[PDB]
Design a protein around this nucleic acid. Sequence first.
RNA 1: UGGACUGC
Length: 214
Amino acid sequence: EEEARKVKSGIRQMRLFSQDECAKIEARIDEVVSRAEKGLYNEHTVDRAPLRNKYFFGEGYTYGAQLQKRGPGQERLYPPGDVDEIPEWVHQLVIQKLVEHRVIPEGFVNSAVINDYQPGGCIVSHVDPIHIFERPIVSVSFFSDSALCFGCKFQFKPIRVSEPVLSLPVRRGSVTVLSGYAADEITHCIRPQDIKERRAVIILRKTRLDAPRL
RNA sequence: UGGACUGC
Ligand SMILES: O=C(O)CNC(=O)C(=O)O
Ligand SMILES: [Mn+2]
């Protein structure tokens, strides 16, 4: 109710990438999945889950079960130079478009993470670690349409999700920017019922200078 | 039937 308007103030969203531009980027995402299957990336570049894969370029992070002590501020960057560099196509096809459209300043993005969701995949509600990433947070969706939900309570065995404070549809080719309240004081997630087809999203962030590393 | 928030 009153919190939903607080979330809306920190959301920017627009259809930035055309259908032709999405197809070219989605072919590059298929190249990343192929190299990961062939084991051509560094070990910490690929993070696999039952219905979701994360591909860390520039800077990666540990999360969830990878944390020995589960708590705020426990996420860590990987050692310097551990994960693979940002691919050239990410700079030219995605980051350059965002910089030229003034979504984020030039030289802001130093971390590009690709999330590849199989049908029915999800990601549990979370705040992007405040001790790791600066604000704002940019994400570009591909392959299919879906939604981003805020303030959801996850329960498991089996996975049940509560009603979101706000549901934001993320259409294919759209850019989502999170700032202020929507990025710091409320979690965001993806519910399994929002992934009907394969969906990939490229999240582009800047890590803090004092971000702790492994 | 696929798990970042108990930051309750
Ligand atoms: O698909 C999305 O936008 C959700 N992804 C995240 O919140 C994340 O990887 O940190
Ligand atoms: Mn996130």
